[PDB]
Structures are given as C-alpha cells and as structure tokens.
Design a binder for this molecule. Structure first.
Ligand SMILES: OC[C@H]1O[C@@](CO)(O[C@H]2O[C@H](CO)[C@@H](O)[C@H](O)[C@H]2O)[C@@H](O)[C@@H]1O
Length: 404
C-alpha cells in the first residue's frame, strides 16, 4: 500500500529530527501504513531551498512537510487546503493567531504544530555566585553582569568562558535575533504590518551598534558564525552566563549528563529601558500536506495525528517545545515538567512577528537583506547608522510593487 514520506525538522538540531521520525513511525505502526523520513539541513532557510526543489518539480516524493511560521505566504501554492478536512471545533483547539497565520487567501495551508519565542537562558548558580539576585531586565545590566562574571570565571581558569552567546550567523536565525534587538530598543518591527519600512531610525541603529559591541568582548568573536546549536553547545558545556535561544534548548540542558543540569532558568529577553516593549521573536512550525501528494487522505490523517493533543504533549514534556493548543498549557504533566511555560506564557502570547505577513511570498528576499545588513554590523564592516539606511533602501527595492 502507500508509503507516506515526511520531510520535517532536522537530526542536526537537538532531538527534533529523531523525535519527528519516531512520531511518524508510531503513526505508521498504529495505522498499518508504511512511512519514510527524509532528513533536512539544520537552518530553516536551507530547508526552504531544499523543499522548493521538490515543489518546483511537483514532486510526489514527499507527502508531508514541516514548514516554518514565516512560510505560508511563500508555500501556499504547494499546500493542500486543509480547511475541508477539519471541523470548526477541531480548528478552534489551536491558537487562533497561528491558524490565521497559516491561512493564506482562505487556504488553510497547514496545521499549527509547535510555537516558539526567543527567550533568555541564564546561569542561576553564577548569578548567585557573583551577588546578583535576578536576571537582567535591561541590555545594560546584561552587559554589566556578563563583564563581571566573565572576569571572575576567566581568573578562576575557565578559558572557554563567555558572557553571552546568540545566533550571529548570516541566516534566518539572525533576522530573529535582530528583530528582538531592534524592537526591544523601541526601533520598530523593521517592516511594519502596514507596509511602512521603518528600520531607518536611530533606535534601530543603536540596537545594532550595541550588538556589535558584544562581539569579541562578552560574546566570542566566532558568534558571527553561530546558529542555534553552536550557541547551545557553548552554553550547554557550562561556558556562557547567558544565551538567547528558543524553548527546545531547555530540555536538552536538563538531560542526564548535561554539565548545566539544574543550574539555569529562563526569562524574557532584556530591553533598552523600562518603557521599551519586551521582545520575543515569534517562531514555530506547522504541518503541511503537499499539493503533489498522491495520498492526500492518508497524509491528512498523519498530520492530524502529529498535531494531536498527545503528540504535542510528548513534544512539550520530552523536548520542551511549546504547544499550539491552549489546553496543554493547563495540563498538569506539561506544567510540572516545564513550569516556565506558565511563567512565560504572556511572553509567548506577545511575541513579535517577523514581517512575513506583509512581505508575503517575498519574505525570504526581505530576510536575506535584513540578515546580511545586520551581519555587516556584527562583523564591523558597517556602523548601525549606515546599515539601517542601506537596509531601508534594499527592502524598498524588494517590496516595490508588492501590496499585501
Ligand atoms: O526544526 C525545528 C527547530 O528549528 C528552530 C531553530 O533551531 O526554529 C526556530 O528558529 C528558526 C530560525 O533559526 C525560526 O525561523 C523558527 O520560526 C523557529 O521556530 C527551533 O526552535 C525548532 O525546535
């Protein structure tokens, strides 16, 4: 009978690919259906390019794709409309914001699978050691704490010790980190939901200059090549006071044999001042049935299973990834394992989106402009003032004649 083939997540990032393959194999065993897992590269933008090869070919060789929150507007032609397959009551079990994000010109492109938001990981043991009682609320405080803890840990002999790690590589992950910097300085959303390209302002420029000032000082020089896992590995080995990353890093840091198990907490990222908005970039992944799948019925069944209460529960408990079902945030087992899901729920609800709705199918070009200009500041090639002006000009060219 049919073989249902899935491309989603990556064995190169944490446990997500291994866990995805496991969930797909469980469905195949439960239903008596043959399945195959196709692995993907680590970085989202690399996955998009890979999957676009299949889509350009109208290839039947993948039935189900795990797609990024930033993609519906790009991938919609390649998605089977799921709306007719779900009742209104079934669809209401997901966060409406994400269902809306995944709905493009009426087509429900994909089911919400897990959500995501950028957060601050902090070493609680080190804060205590150096006399700090709370994680930093401002970027200035983050810098001051990192300098002091770094000075002390270096003097005690840890050559590998840094104050802060984050994603500074030129790829989509840096657009995520940079939105957070800019928004948390009161510099706006780069491109506003109304279409206004707002990034050429002094607050955005200051945000980028500040981030440059970390490189080689409180963050490793090599941070400009770090994606999620490079940051996580310095952190997880016990070599960074602070890290910006997503929820998945938490369960991995708590695993038996982690050097940092029991030594960290999480909180909202810091911001420029008390009246700036909190910034947590919205992430998350969705489950799409290919428009080119020969087996839409079986594929939809697998997608419903993956997005079900019990599979999302397993994702939350074992992988610390955020459900897209509000009911799971009150589940006793979810919360006992990850209490911070409750503490940070308002951070997740107020997460700031990248400009994927307003850029639509041009989002990947916009993001590439953003990450390359931001990177030029991190590498010291340009100051923030020049980079935001240049970025404005680039985005204006990219979105000229685009209406939303
Ligand atoms: O494969 C899922 C896995 O990818 C991550 C990053 O490792 O996804 C987040 O980061 C991306 C940028 O690098 C965002 O585009 C995406 O929206 C966001 O979810 C993990 O957090 C996630 O478990």
């Amino acid at each position: 009978g049919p073989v249902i083939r899935v491309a989603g997540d990556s064995t190169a990032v944490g446990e997500g690919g291994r866990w995805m393959k496991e969930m797909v194999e469980a469905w195949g065993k439960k239903t008596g259906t043959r399945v195959e897992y196709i692995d993907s590269p680590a970085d989202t933008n690399d996955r998009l390019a890979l999957y676009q090869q299949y889509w350009a070919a109208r290839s039947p060789d993948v039935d189900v794709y795990m797609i990024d929150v930033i993609w519906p507007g790009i991938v919609a032609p390649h998605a089977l409309d799921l709306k007719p397959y779900l009742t209104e009551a079934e669809l209401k079990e997901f966060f409406p914001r994400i269902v809306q994000n995944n709905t493009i010109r009426g087509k429900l492109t994909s089911l919400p699978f897990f959500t995501d938001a950028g957060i601050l990981y902090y070493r609680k043991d080190l804060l205590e050691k150096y006399g700090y009682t709370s994680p930093p609320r401002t970027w200035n405080e983050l810098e001051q704490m990192a300098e002091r803890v770094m000075e002390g840990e270096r003097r005690a002999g840890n050559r590998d010790f840094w104050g802060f790690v984050f994603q500074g590589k030129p790829y989509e992950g840096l657009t995520c980190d940079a939105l957070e910097w800019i928004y948390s300085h009161g510099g706006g959303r780069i491109v506003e939901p109304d279409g206004t390209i707002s990034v050429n302002n002094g607050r955005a420029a200051l945000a980028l200059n500040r981030a440059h000032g970390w490189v080689g000082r409180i963050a490793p020089q090599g941070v400009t090549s770090y994606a999620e896992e490079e940051a996580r590995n310095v952190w997880q080995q016990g070599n960074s006071l602070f890290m910006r990353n997503w929820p998945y890093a938490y369960a991995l840091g708590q695993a038996e044999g982690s050097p940092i198990r029991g030594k960290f907490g999480v909180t909202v990222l810091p911001k420029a001042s008390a009246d700036a908005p909190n910034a947590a970039t919205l992430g998350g992944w969705q489950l799409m049935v290919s428009a080119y799948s020969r087996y839409p019925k079986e594929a939809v069944d697998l997608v419903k299973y993956l997005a079900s209460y019990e599979v999302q529960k397993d994702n939350a408990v074992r992988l610390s990834r955020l459900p897209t079902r509000p009911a799971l945030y009150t589940d006793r087992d979810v919360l006992a394992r990850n209490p911070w899901f409750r503490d940070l729920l308002p951070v997740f609800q107020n997460a700031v989106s990248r400009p994927s709705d307003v850029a639509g199918a041009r989002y990947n070009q916009v993001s590439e402009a953003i990450w390359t200009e931001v990177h030029s500041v991190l590498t010291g090639r340009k100051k923030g003032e020049q980079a935001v002006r240049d970025l404005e000009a680039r985005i204006r060219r990219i979105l000229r004649h685009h209406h939303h």
